[PDB]
């Protein structure tokens, strides 16, 4: 059948791709630069697909082949093709190339291919052994470049334990590996390990532990924008649970801004959900466009109903949407925040009143916010003013709420501070861009 | 110039029938039935009956079906005769006639496929333009957004290759109608103002209807100077508005700052706009934008005004003006704030320097986000 | 013809006299201007609002107490407008660089 022949063709182009990747790994090893490693792991997700049993069998029978225990470990875990007519001997290593032991980069990359393919076959137990052997091999290695590769497999390791639904037999190991990376002053490995540990903490709901670590540990700035986005999302969740709502909103906005354009639909959906919830907690109505995006329409539709209910001020609609779709929030891990918003809706009305009016009396505020008594209105407006949501003061002598008069900000030092932040960022960008300049010898 | 098939009046009457308060109307039913029986429109009769749960007249339906069948047989016979004896021009004309009849009798998919086949066989550029215009008319009749967009792109490309000014003007009218259909009122006002002096697409609507649409959309889109120069002082617009006192009053009340008359005329315009088949979903949006426009125009000339002054100017109560003002400030549409103790609205229009600084902050923040993303992408 | 042209002339004369009696003051009330030009307060207020709206003589009416303030319309600060234009220009340049950098 010609279909099998075309499958063989795409398989051998994948073989060429992985040959190029291992060549780049060796060039990084012999070129004293880790950026080639980063490029190899950047091409890694693209070739994580398009592979089958024979692709990996020919890979492991083309590389390694030094009669080491590696062959005895990875060959039995995957099937083998029959005596095919096209017995094209794929041997990237010839003689002395096959004689020397494989570099940690190439062996780690091929073992990574084994574990991701095994995961794609959805038999997690088989991949568990290969991952454990991989990280037994790479634990002793202190290669700086390998850490990059190590970083990636680190993530994959946690990933497989997600399908094993344990996430706890390895928590101590991730802690120790993160500590090792910290003493190695590594950037990528430390960042990815922090992200994985935070994900584990939130999966097991240990928010206090995550808050303690993020207070103690420092996320490396010089990390991947993807890892930065994951860390920002986790930190935003932490601050939202810790009631630090404004900082959580800012952090989640930064995470959304650093999202991979249109690559991670699920991560963007979760970030949008949490950001909408926390923004509602602040009393700010979110952007409407979020609900009309092609990928986030149905996902945020219950949140559209929630936002409509709170903006309209109909607490009955709030309870109704809690009854029908609120259970979904439990699957989304936001139910507690939604209850907090159920009991914090009135903040949005107070903010609206402050935005529109400037000297509205307490009785008018109570009338427009469905508050039973003017004294309750006084309490609510005073609390909102104290909690940094309103910029007014209540003249209790005659009961009117005078907002702080708007002063010409350009005549103040605020524009200077904003321009200072912008100038510092621009100068830092110029320094970073000129600092590398990558002039080869 | 171009034939009135399909009739947009039929679509307007069907939409009016679909409206709740006009569902029980009879005159709309009489006019639509007269149009169908003058056109012998059977498939669209079935579609309307199933959409409106109407009681189909078996005798009339059978007569329409038989007439359509014999006519289609006649067109097929003419097509075969042209193929056997005549050249490609006569077979092309026969196929265009068949597609035109299919669109006339209300067939949507049949007309689409026949016109597509004709366009495949069409060579003369003018006839390709005519077929594309027919497809655009069908899409407007059925409000098919994808069909309208694709045919608009096709017509634009064809005119760019070779375009006579007449067909370009007609395409401008069609584009303005579609822009109205998609609430893109700025482009619709642009096109309608460009085509008001040379409006020749009478198949879409009468001149008075086109001018009313132009006035409405230009009012919602143009600022005060452009509205005064191009609409208030418009020659043809004023000429036709001499025969439309209501639309003229609505337009001139806002320009002359007669806000009570303007509000009454806006209520009348909203009532007219609800029944319109093309301005249907945007009537609330148009009314809200007009209210915001009137409020902003009044507040542009005042620093601090009593709420009673607006209540008297717009001819409303204090409570209503207060509620509308509060809702529009809360949405960030009006640059003012209300002192309910004194019931005085004080404008908060930023000065030139403050507005420039805010725009600089916004644009620089966007550009710096782009710069940071680019740098993090390229520096590995 | 007579009615239209005389109405136009009367409006222009009203505008000219309103500008003439507004040069000395800075925060004159509408009542004093109405007394000076001898019309109703409402007509004068409506005319002044029309001139202010139409980018005529610069000032804002304070209906709360009854005043029409006057100022000197600060120019526009050409520096900031050119800065905004440059920000847009290098936004375009950043899009162009986004078109580049696709070659790794």
């Amino acid at each position: 059948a010609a279909a099998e022949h075309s499958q063989r063709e795409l398989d051998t182009v994948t073989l060429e791709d992985i040959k190029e990747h291992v060549k780049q790994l060796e060039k990084a090893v012999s070129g004293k630069e880790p950026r080639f490693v980063l490029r190899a792991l950047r091409m890694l997700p693209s070739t994580s697909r398009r592979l089958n049993h024979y692709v990996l069998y020919k890979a492991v029978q083309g590389f390694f082949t030094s009669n080491n225990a590696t062959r005895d470990f990875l060959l039995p875990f995957l099937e083998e093709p029959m005596d095919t007519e096209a017995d094209l001997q794929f041997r990237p290593r010839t003689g002395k190339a096959a004689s020397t032991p494989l570099l940690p980069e190439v062996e780690a990359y091929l073992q990574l291919l084994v574990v991701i393919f095994m995961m794609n076959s959805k038999r997690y137990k088989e991949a568990q052994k290969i991952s454990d052997d991989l990280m037994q091999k790479i634990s002793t290695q202190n290669r700086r470049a390998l850490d990059l590769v190590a970083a990636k497999c680190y993530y994959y390791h946690a990933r497989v334990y997600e399908f094993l639904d344990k996430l706890d037999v390895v928590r101590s190991f991730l802690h120790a590996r993160l500590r090792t990376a910290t003493l190695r002053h590594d950037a990528d490995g430390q960042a990815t390990l922090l992200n994985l540990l935070l994900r584990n903490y939130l999966h097991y709901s240990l928010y206090d532990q995550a808050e303690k670590l993020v207070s103690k540990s420092v996320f490396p700035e010089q990390a991947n924008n993807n890892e930065w986005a994951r860390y920002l999302y986790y930190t935003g969740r932490i601050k939202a649970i810790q009631l630090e709502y404004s900082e959580a909103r800012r952090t989640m906005t930064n995470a959304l801004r650093k999202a991979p354009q249109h690559t991670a639909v699920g991560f963007k959906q979760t970030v949008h959900k949490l950001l909408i919830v926390v923004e509602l907690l602040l009393g700010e109505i979110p952007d409407r466009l979020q609900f009309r995006q092609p990928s986030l329409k149905r996902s945020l539709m219950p949140y559209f109903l929630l936002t409509q209910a709170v903006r309209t001020g109909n607490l009955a609609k709030f309870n109704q949407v809690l009854d029908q779709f609120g259970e979904k929030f439990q699957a989304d891990g936001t139910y507690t925040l939604i209850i907090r918003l159920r009991h914090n809706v009135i903040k949005t009305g107070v903010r609206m009143i402050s935005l529109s009016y400037s000297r509205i009396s307490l009785a008018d505020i109570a009338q427009k916010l469905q508050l039973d008594s003017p004294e309750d209105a006084e309490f609510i407006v005073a609390k909102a003013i104290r909690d940094g949501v309103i910029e007014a003061s209540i003249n209790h002598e005659k009961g009117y709420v005078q907002s702080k008069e708007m002063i010409d900000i350009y005549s103040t030092r605020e524009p200077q501070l904003a321009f200072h932040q912008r100038i510092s960022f621009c100068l830092d960008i110029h320094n970073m861009s000129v600092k590398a300049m990558r002039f080869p010898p | 110039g171009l034939p009135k098939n399909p009739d947009l009046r039929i679509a307007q009457l069907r939409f009016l029938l679909s409206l709740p308060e006009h569902r029980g109307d009879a005159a709309v039913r009489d006019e639509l039935m007269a149009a169908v029986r003058d056109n012998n429109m059977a498939p669209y009769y079935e579609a309307l009956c199933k959409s409106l749960d109407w009681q189909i007249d078996v005798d009339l339906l059978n007569k329409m079906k038989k007439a359509n069948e014999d006519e289609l047989k006649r067109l097929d016979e003419e097509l075969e005769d042209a193929e056997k004896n005549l050249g490609e021009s006569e077979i092309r004309d026969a196929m265009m006639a068949k597609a035109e009849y299919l669109c006339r009798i209300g067939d949507k998919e049949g007309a689409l496929t026949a016109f597509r086949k004709t366009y495949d066989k069409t060579v003369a550029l003018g006839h390709r333009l005519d077929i594309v215009f027919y497809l655009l008319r069908i899409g407007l009749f059925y409000m098919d957004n994808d069909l309208i967009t694709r045919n608009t792109e096709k017509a634009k490309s064809l005119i760019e290759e070779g375009g006579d000014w007449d067909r370009r003007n007609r395409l401008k009218v069609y584009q303005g109608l579609y822009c109205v259909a998609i609430r893109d009122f700025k482009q619709a006002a642009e096109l309608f103002l460009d085509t008001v002096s040379t409006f020749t697409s009478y198949e879409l609507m009468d001149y008075k209807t086109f001018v009313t649409y132009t006035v409405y959309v230009s009012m919602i889109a143009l600022e005060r100077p452009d509205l005064r120069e191009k609409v208030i002082k418009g020659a043809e617009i004023l000429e036709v508005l001499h025969s439309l006192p209501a639309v003229r009053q609505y337009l001139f009340s806002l320009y002359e700052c007669r806000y009570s008359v303007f509000f009454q005329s806006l209520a009348v315009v909203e009532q007219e706009m609800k029944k319109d088949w093309l301005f249907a979903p945007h009537y609330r949006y148009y009314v809200r934008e007009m209210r915001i426009h009137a409020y902003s125009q009044l507040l542009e000339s005042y620093r601090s005004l009593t709420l009673g002054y607006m209540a008297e100017a717009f001819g409303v109560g204090v409570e209503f003006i207060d509620q509308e003002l509060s809702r529009f400030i809360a949405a960030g549409r009006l640059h003012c704030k209300i002192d309910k103790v004194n019931e005085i609205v004080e404008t908060n229009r930023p000065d030139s320097k403050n507005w420039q600084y805010q725009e600089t902050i916004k644009k620089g923040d966007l550009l710096l986000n782009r710069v940071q993303k680019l740098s993090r992408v390229i520096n590995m | 013809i007579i009615s239209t042209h005389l109405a136009k002339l009367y409006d222009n004369l009203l505008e000219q006299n309103l500008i003439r009696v507004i040069e000395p003051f800075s925060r004159v009330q509408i009542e004093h201007i109405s007394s000076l030009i001898k019309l109703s307060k409402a007509d004068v207020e409506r005319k002044l609002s029309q001139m202010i709206l139409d980018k005529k003589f610069h000032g804002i009416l304070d209906q709360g107490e009854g005043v029409l303030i006057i100022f000197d319309e600060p120019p526009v600060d050409k520096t900031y407008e050119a800065a905004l234009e440059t920000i847009q220009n290098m936004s375009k340049v950043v899009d162009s660089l986004y078109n580049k950098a696709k070659k790794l």
Partner: peptide, 30 residues
């Protein structure tokens, strides 16, 4: 701030050009 932004964009363009040039040389070596 405008001048600093101008300089940063120029430096970013220069870095992109340099990376493109060195990759071009590396691929043209083979």
């Amino acid at each position: 701030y405008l001048a600093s932004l101008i300089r940063s964009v120029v430096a970013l363009h220069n870095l992109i050009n340099n990376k493109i040039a060195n990759r071009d040389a590396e691929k043209k070596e083979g």
